[PDB]
Homo-oligomer: A and B are copies of this chain.
């Protein structure tokens, strides 16, 4: 059955990919080649062109992503050649450096060898390559609560965090044939961070907030034509609300709205004062201001929704069905101020695509 699933996914992907690349005449011979290879080896190997376009298609098909206008300019780094943990580590360091690009962020994906018989070759434990640790013990909470379980797993392996609110987690991944993952501290010279200040309110720096420049999701599987690339970290740039309305605001994250209210000089006593809403707006203005001031790419939710509108228009004009998840596409600040809120989207799953996979710890 698994070989049949593979062959069916291969046929659909190769046909679609080659149509898009103006290579339709080559589909027949390529499919034959693939079928022989599946018969003989149990799998097949993508050409560099297939792999690159497949990763782009997968972004284009990501229903929850507002940033899809730029799908065709994804920078795809092919690292199916890695075999050692030093090679993996250096590939991840390189991804950080090249994606960061001195602040002018380049959307990038690095693709490692795919699962073989559902057997991973490289298993990355980080949720993002750059992320802050979290600690909770005896009612004492430090750092990012979303990272508590991974932080605990790292400290099981001999890592020790300084227990600031912004400890950088090490890279942690496991190689096929190894029982335990290895970990490596991130060189700080590779990691851009942005202190959060407000354009008008000088006291805002008293909160001593900061965030990292580049979100690099490293725990999703890229599936392309039936091949499962479980290790394929990718990044774009942030939309400001991710940081200002969620990472720094959620009660189960950094939970900063009361502190924000205080530094902006408003009471946090009455729901009818909409102090949470006002604090959210100022924190979000500060996040955008701060990234811009430092020359680190970021997009605000209005501009992002406008770009997404163009993505919708582009899909229609290309004759492609548009899919989307309305519940994730609306921003968490002023959603009804965007066109997204006012239309609906078909949430059908189309492949290639990026998928959740089980965490190797917890």
Contact = CB atoms under 8 A, between A and B. Distances in A.
Contact of A281 (B272, B281, B336): B281
How many A residues are at the interface, by size bracket? 20 to 34
Contact of A271 (B250, B272, B281, B303): B303
A129 to B, nearest CB: 25
A240 to B, nearest CB: 8
Contacts of A281: 274, 277-278, 281
Contact of A341 (B277, B332, B336, B337): B332
Contact of A333 (B250, B289, B334): B334
Contacts of A272: 288-289, 292, 300, 303
A327 interface: yes
Contact of A336 (B246, B285, B326): B246
A276 B336 contact: no
A332 B332 contact: no
Nearest to A284: B274
Nearest to A338: B276
A14 interface: no
Interface in A220-274: 245-246, 249-250, 257, 271-274
Interface centre among A245, A246, A273, A336 (most CB of B within 10 A): A336
Nearest to A241: B336
A257 B337 CA distance: 10
Contact of A284 (B277, B284, B303, B306): B277
Given A303-B271, A326-B327, A334 B285 contact: no
Contacts of A330: 335
A302 interface: yes
A334 B280 contact: yes
Nearest to A292: B272
Interface in A98-127: none
Interface string A279-306: 0110011001100100000001011001
Given A335-B332, A335-B335, A274 B245 contact: no
B332 A277 contact: no
Given A271-B300, A272-B300, A288-B272, A277 B327 contact: no
A332 B272 CA distance: 16
Interface in A295-345: 300, 302-303, 306, 326-327, 330, 332-337, 341
B292 A285 contact: no
Nearest to A337: B276
Contacts of A246: 336
Which 4 pairs, one residue from A and one from B, show the smallest C-beta to C-beta distance?
A: A332-B336, A271-B302, A277-B334, A277-B281
Interface of A: 245-246, 249-250, 257, 271-274, 276-278, 280-281, 284-285, 288-289, 292, 300, 302-303, 306, 326-327, 330, 332-337, 341
6 contacts: A250-B336, A274-B288, A274-B333, A276-B302, A277-B284, A330-B335
